[PDB]
Amino acid sequence: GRDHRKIGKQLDLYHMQEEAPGMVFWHNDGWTIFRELEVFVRSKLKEYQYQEVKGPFMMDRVLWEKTGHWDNYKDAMFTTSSENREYCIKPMNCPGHVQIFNQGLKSYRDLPLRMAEFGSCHRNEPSGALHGLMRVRGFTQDDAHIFCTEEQIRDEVNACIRMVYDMYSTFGFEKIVVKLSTRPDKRIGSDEMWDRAEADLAVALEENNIPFEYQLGEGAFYGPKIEFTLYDCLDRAWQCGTVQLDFSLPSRLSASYVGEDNERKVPVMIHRAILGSMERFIGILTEEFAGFFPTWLAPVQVVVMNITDSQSEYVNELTQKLQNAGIRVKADLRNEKIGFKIREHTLRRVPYMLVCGDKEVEAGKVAVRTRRGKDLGSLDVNDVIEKLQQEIRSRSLQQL
Amino acid sequence: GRDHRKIGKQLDLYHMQEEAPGMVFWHNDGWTIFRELEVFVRSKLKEYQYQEVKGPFMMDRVLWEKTGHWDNYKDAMFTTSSENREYCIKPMNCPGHVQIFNQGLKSYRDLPLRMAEFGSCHRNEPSGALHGLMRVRGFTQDDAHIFCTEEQIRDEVNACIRMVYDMYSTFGFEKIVVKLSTRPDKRIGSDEMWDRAEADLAVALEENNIPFEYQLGEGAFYGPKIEFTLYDCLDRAWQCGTVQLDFSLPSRLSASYVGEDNERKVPVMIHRAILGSMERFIGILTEEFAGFFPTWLAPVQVVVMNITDSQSEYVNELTQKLQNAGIRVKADLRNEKIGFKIREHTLRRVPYMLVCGDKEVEAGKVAVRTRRGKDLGSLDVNDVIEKLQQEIRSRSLQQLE
Ligand SMILES: CN[C@H](C(=O)NC/C=C/Cn1cnc2cc(Cl)c(Cl)cc2c1=O)[C@@H](C)O
Ligand SMILES: CN[C@H](C(=O)NC/C=C/Cn1cnc2cc(Cl)c(Cl)cc2c1=O)[C@@H](C)O
Ligand SMILES: [Zn+2]
Ligand SMILES: [Zn+2]
């Protein structure tokens, strides 16, 4: 029993309905998980030196036909109109990122320019194939685009690779399969361009001792790509990560920069996503942990509870201390038995349950108990807050 | 200058294009401002006990036709189709909030249920009427909908009112004009219901000692409302806040709860937004401050800089300390004169320029220069960091002395 649909209903994370096929209603607790995942990605964006931008939801069809994706993907577009002009709701964030790149004069000094976005994308997929958070219409891509020179591709692909494995290992995903898609029959650019582009991805992987299988037929018309597939605890494959070279879209959208020789060069563009889809990754995480989210991701991290009315003031004071320390905490002061209380929050998958009786109030302590059923006993209040802070801020998979 | 369109280009906050009319492209520095504003609103949502949800971008026309807004507002709807079904791109967040409310059986004990959202709304407005961040098509509403009983209305409107003045006072807006819109000709509900609903709004304003005025017959068909018009430093009026009672939508979308008497009851809905639009409000703030955003909102809060090559490592350490202290900081180690460095970052509206000369490195201090051109002297590094943190924590309008 690890269905994300089931756990999503039980823990009141999200729901879906027929009026909005493949588009998620995020409830309070599920939206908390979403935002903590977002905060985690932002810390990595800062570490790996990315800008974070936000592009518009719609854009003119005139611009979308200039991208070169229209013929292959017009059936997957959501279109709307206003004042005799047809606009596409964006399925990808790349054209919008080029529009920001084109504002102001760029030079080689500004490259590599790394532009990230939590980009809300909509794709008009057949409704019959939709299921849960795994196959959806509306989703949020942990997207970024790297504008760089031909000489900087090698280093930026290395950095993307490091960022992929770093982020996957945070959630305990160590079994990764890597696939390098080579030149297709369609394709733009010369054979010498594809020789170099394919070598840049291959050597970057080889130098990091990462084994990979070639995918000969597959690969986009605008460049080769690396795709990363993680494996969950049921040994199910999930293609999440991508690193995709592009020698087309920047030229077609009039992107350029002044080089060191004062000539106009078209920048090389690297598409990349790691989690793939925020909704989809949450689904995978919900199943991986079976509702037992690590404390940093958990909607409710601690519940503090009393035995009788005698300890209510102490529990309220302890609740405020935990809230002051940046912990998501609730107080359970109901007139129920301690076994009833602990069970409700053990079923809700609350990492820690802080019991406070007369023993604990007089001592300045708290009786800590995990959702796994491990009784840690009466511990000092300041010691508990300190260890919870470390677990949350280090983003540890394991409890005490 | 106080033109947000000019300043937006100068500080590289955002831009707009004819390919996406009335829809903002947020650059790094503008999106940084957006996200801190979002964090600020979030802390108020936590304080005033709101849930935060996220609804889908589109929903079937069939559901939108049931809301009772369709015939009045179908011209303003963006529409898209898929598999013989028509979907509206959401212009408002209320129906989606009702869909979330309708999941699970609700009790009187769950009320008042306060459900907030940073709701990305799209209104198909005329392109000739568009103008920068203020008049837009795509925007993010600091929205919330309170589901409550009839008896709970006064206390919830009272809370909303407090939240409005609280949030406006953070940005330096004390002069608020308040307008209570009364019953229109075409309306639902009995006159007895409208007497209580209008009285609930008036009593809540009286309870907060707020003088207001009527706007006669300007209320919506589904209930009366309060609107809050703030005044900037140029004495220009901006209608941002709204608190709108609703006796229609919950019933139209099958919203109910189990009462204390065990009867099925329909909840009353209070629509409310304080800032009104995140894009619009940032635009107003840009002109209010003239680009001199308070330190907590500033894209780059501190720039640490060296006079000569001698202090480059001291700058690196100091920049790392400010990095570890959660301050948005950059190091200016370019081979340029100290005045050149100060003039550029004064023009970019960086609150503080932490200057490092030989005398500062030797004493373990830093020379603090504000964007207003003032000299705060050479202070201890750990003192300055604690003071900057306190200025950011409290979201202070004023810089250090
Ligand atoms: C092309 N952008 C990248 C991306 O999304 N890569 C994953 C796979 C993309 C394939 N893909 C899938 N569906 C699409 C649907 C539409 Cl309507 C369009 Cl116009 C493009 C695509 C499209 O390109 C990100 C990583 O920047
Ligand atoms: C709709 N409720 C509130 C709100 O947005 N009020 C501000 C103004 C509302 C007036 N308004 C303006 N434009 C609209 C456009 C459309 Cl396509 C629809 Cl369906 C409704 C409205 C509509 O009601 C929020 C705060 O919950
Ligand atoms: Zn892309
Ligand atoms: Zn509303």
Domain count, chain A: 2
Q: Structure resolution in Å? A: 2.5
Place of tokens 């990315």: A50
Q: How far is A400 from chain B (nearest CA, A)?
A: 27
Q: Is B117 helix (H, G, I), strand (E, B) or coil?
A: strand
Asked whether the beta carbons of B306 and B314 are under 8 A apart, the reply is yes
Give whole-number Cα distances, A21 to A18, A123, A142, B117, in Å.
5, 12, 22, 21
Strands B113-122 and B138-148: antiparallel
Ligand 2 contact, B69 CB (< 6 A)? yes
- Interchain pair A53, B34: CB under 8 A: no
Cα–Cα distance, A203 to A161 (Å, whole number): 12
Asked whether the beta carbons of A224 and A194 are under 8 A apart, the reply is yes
Looking from the CA of A218 toward its CB, the CA atoms found within 13 Å total 10
Ligand 2 contact, B76 CB (< 6 A)? yes
Residues of chain A with Cβ-Cβ distance to B60 below 8 Å are 18-20
A94 and A151 in a single domain? The answer is yes
A242 and A364 in a single domain? The answer is no
Cα–Cα distance, A123 to A75 (Å, whole number): 9
Amino acid (one-letter) located at B107: S
Looking from the CA of B211 toward its CB, the CA atoms found within 13 Å total 1
Rounded to the nearest whole angstrom, what is the distance from the C-alpha of residue A92 to the centroid of ligand 1? 6
Residue ranges for the known binding site of A are 94, 143, 145, 271
Evaluated on CA atoms B158, B164, B170, B174, the torsion sign reads negative
Altogether, the residues listed in chain B come to a count of 401
Cα–Cα distance, A353 to A340 (Å, whole number): 12
A49 and A196 in a single domain? The answer is yes
Amino acid (one-letter) located at A47: E
Looking from the CA of A342 toward its CB, the CA atoms found within 13 Å total 18
Residues of chain A with Cβ-Cβ distance to B15 below 8 Å are 100, 103
- Structural domain boundaries, residue A305: 291-400
Long-range contacts (CB closer than 8 Å, 24 or more residues apart) made by B235-239: B237/B177, B238/B284, B239/B276
A145 and A182 in a single domain? The answer is yes
Q: Name residues 114-153 of chain A within 8 A of B (Cβ).
A: 120, 122, 124, 126-127, 138
B132 and B188 in a single domain? The answer is yes
Name the nearest CA neighbour of B147 among B103, B179, B180: B103
B262 and B377 in a single domain? The answer is no
Atom of ligand 1 lying closest to residue A88 CA:
17
A277 and A297 in a single domain? The answer is no
Cα–Cα distance, B4 to B16 (Å, whole number): 12
Place of tokens 């609804």: B55
Domain end call among A269, A290, A311: A290
Token pair listed for A185: 């029959």
Cα–Cα distance, B164 to B208 (Å, whole number): 12
Cα–Cα distance, B102 to A298 (Å, whole number): 24
CB of A224 less than 8 A from some CB of B: no
A162 and A303 in a single domain? The answer is no
A202 and A332 in a single domain? The answer is no
CB of A113 less than 8 A from some CB of B: no
Name the nearest CA neighbour of A220 among A253, A192, A251, A242: A242
B210 and B348 in a single domain? The answer is no
β-sheet bridge partners, residue B176: B230
Residue of B69, B97, B137, B143 marked catalytic: B143
Q: Is A144 helix (H, G, I), strand (E, B) or coil?
A: strand
- Interchain pair B53, A83: CB under 8 A: no
Place of tokens 């017959």: B217
Contacts of A83 (CB under 8 A, 6+ apart): B126, B127
Name the nearest CA neighbour of B25 among A143, A98, A64: A98
A102 and A141 in a single domain? The answer is yes
β-sheet bridge partners, residue A81: A86
Cα–Cα distance, B286 to B10 (Å, whole number): 12
DSSP class of A74: G
A135 and A259 in a single domain? The answer is yes
Ligand 2 contact, B90 CB (< 6 A)? no
Cα–Cα distance, A200 to A194 (Å, whole number): 10
Name the nearest CA neighbour of A297 among A33, A2, A41: A33
Alpha-helical (H) ranges within B228-377 are: 249-252, 278-289, 312-324, 338-347, 358-363
Asked whether the beta carbons of A1 and A290 are under 8 A apart, the reply is yes
Ligand positioned closest to the Cα atom of B243: 2
Asked whether the beta carbons of A80 and A58 are under 8 A apart, the reply is yes
- H/E stretch holding A26: strand A25-26
Q: Is A123 helix (H, G, I), strand (E, B) or coil?
A: coil
Ligand positioned closest to the Cα atom of B218: 2
Cα–Cα distance, A382 to A255 (Å, whole number): 56
**Per-residue b/e over B320-341, b at no fewer than 16 CB within 10 Å?**
ebbeebebbbbbbbeeeebeeb
Pocket of ligand 1 (CB under 6 A): A 69, 73, 76-77, 91-92, 94, 123, 143, 242, 271-273
Rounded to the nearest whole angstrom, what is the distance from the C-alpha of residue B198 to the centroid of ligand 2? 20
Asked whether the beta carbons of A9 and A15 are under 8 A apart, the reply is yes
Q: Is B377 helix (H, G, I), strand (E, B) or coil?
A: strand
Token pair listed for A241: 């990560």
Residue nearest ligand 1's atom 5 by CA: A92
Cα–Cα distance, B270 to B272 (Å, whole number): 6
Contacts A–B by Cβ distance under 8 A: 128
Atom of ligand 1 lying closest to residue A144 CA:
26
Rounded to the nearest whole angstrom, what is the distance from the C-alpha of residue B134 to the centroid of ligand 3? 30
Residues of chain A with Cβ-Cβ distance to B137 below 8 Å are 58, 82
Active site residues of A: 94, 123, 141, 143, 145, 225, 271
Asked whether the beta carbons of B15 and B109 are under 8 A apart, the reply is no
Cα–Cα distance, B286 to B6 (Å, whole number): 10
Cα–Cα distance, A46 to B153 (Å, whole number): 45
- Interchain pair A124, B25: CB under 8 A: no
Domain end call among B264, B290, B316: B290
Domain end call among A290, A309, A335: A290
Q: Compare all CA atoms of chain A with the CA of B121 and give the residue at the minimum distance.
A: A57
Q: Compare all CA atoms of chain A with the CA of B50 and give the residue at the minimum distance.
A: A28
Asked whether the beta carbons of A141 and A273 are under 8 A apart, the reply is yes
* Ordered strands of the A375-380 beta sheet: A329-332, A302-306, A352-356, A365-370, A375-380
Name the nearest CA neighbour of A148 among A47, A50, A9: A50
Rounded to the nearest whole angstrom, what is the distance from the C-alpha of residue A99 to the centroid of ligand 3? 13
